[PDB]
Amino acid sequence: SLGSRRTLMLLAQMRRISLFSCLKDRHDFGFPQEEFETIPVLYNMISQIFNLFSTKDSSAAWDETLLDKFYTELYQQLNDLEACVDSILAVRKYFQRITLYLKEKKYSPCAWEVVRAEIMRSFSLSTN
């Protein structure tokens, strides 16, 4: 709702460098968007973003104030989903693909931008 608009802005603000200089490192992650009643896939989706941007590795890559405001948006998002109460296997495998990409890239600055911009698409897709 207000969380998506206010969440993407934070992702948007977090950018540390030119996207043009990172074009080389772009890669198709094949996000399974057909998955996007649906709540169980969403809670799965988010819990991964949270637990992903919470690594010691993520912390070195992004502004702490932005990261924080970010966790806060998702934190409230998870409670909302918690309350109401294979696809995930596919959504989980996707994050396996992402995790692997970063490793291989040794978490290069550009490799992090490739992923940030990709999560904005994944998230925005799942929200509309």
């Binding site: 819990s47 637990n51 405001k69 934190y75 918690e82 296997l89």
Partner: protein, 285 residues
């Protein structure tokens, strides 16, 4: 080759001779052996950094060799993840006069199975008095958590199981752990906490029932209670060691977001234990 039926906890395999270990993914051609699981004693093989992802749907082969002959035990192609059950969580306690604190993490910390799913655990437990055995069941807790309304010098026991609201998947229980709350706090805690705004600045007040106490007030981001590993309460400065039952500080002190609060009483010699906690939006109007 008569097939075998195998269950999973965390990063382990459990059968239910000496043994060897293979798999071929659906889409199988080759057959590879997971290290350390060839010619082994036990019926559980651990594979952290042994198997790359547990998100595929595999097929297993088991070589069971009794004397001079080795039998063939296949395994119906499964997905590890779908079968995996959450291992017993790790439990850590800190005792008080009226209350207990819980710090919790997945057993098999850094589990390859869990990967990311870990920051997302919901925990649920059952606790009771040592002799009374009155069990108050408490589901849906967060990685670290505090329990109030208890009697001093009293031994409580408990076991914890993990759960993931995410996949229907739910976990095995920790061992039971017990502790005996300390003797009652001499200075009891400030008790009912409430916050309000006036003009732009901020103010909150509590009930300490004794005269001449100071109060060191602290805050925490609300979301950090779900993040068990590695966490610091920051103190609110205008309020540091105030002489009265309220203290104030302006709007700009908290950026918009969601926080946790707590309050402490001290006479300068024996301090008190902390008040109960509270949260707010940082949005009102």
């Amino acid at each position: 080759p008569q097939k075998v039926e195998v269950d999973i906890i965390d990063d382990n395999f459990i059968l239910r001779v000496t043994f060897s270990f293979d798999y071929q993914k659906t889409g199988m051609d080759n057959w590879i052996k997971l290290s350390g699981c060839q010619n082994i004693t036990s019926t559980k093989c651990n594979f952290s950094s042994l198997k790359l992802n547990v998100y595929e749907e595999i097929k297993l082969r088991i070589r069971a060799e009794k004397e001079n002959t080795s039998s063939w035990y296949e395994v119906d192609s499964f997905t590890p993840f779908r079968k995996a059950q959450i291992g017993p969580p790790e439990v850590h306690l800190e005792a008080e006069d009226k209350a207990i604190v819980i710090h919790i993490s997945p057993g098999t910390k850094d589990s390859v199975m869990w990967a990311l799913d870990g920051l997302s655990f919901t925990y649920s437990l059952v606790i009771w008095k040592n002799s009374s055995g009155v069990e108050e069941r408490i589901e849906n807790i967060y990685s670290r958590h505090k329990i109030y309304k208890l009697s001093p010098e009293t031994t409580y026991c408990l076991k914890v199981k993990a759960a993931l609201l995410t996949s229907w998947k739910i976990g095995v229980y920790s061992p039971v752990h017990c502790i005996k709350t300390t003797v009652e706090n001499e200075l009891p805690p400030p008790e009912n906490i409430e916050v309000s705004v006036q003009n732009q600045n901020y103010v909150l007040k509590w009930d300490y029932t004794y005269a001449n106490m100071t109060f060191q007030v602290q805050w925490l981001h609300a979301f950090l209670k779900r993040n068990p590993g590695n966490y610091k309460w920051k103190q609110i400065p205008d309020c540091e060691n105030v002489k009265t039952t309220q203290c104030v500080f302006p709007q700009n002190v908290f950026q918009k977001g969601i926080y946790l609060l707590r309050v402490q009483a001290s006479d300068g010699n024996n301090t008190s234990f902390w008040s109960e906690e509270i949260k707010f939006d940082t949005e009102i109007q």
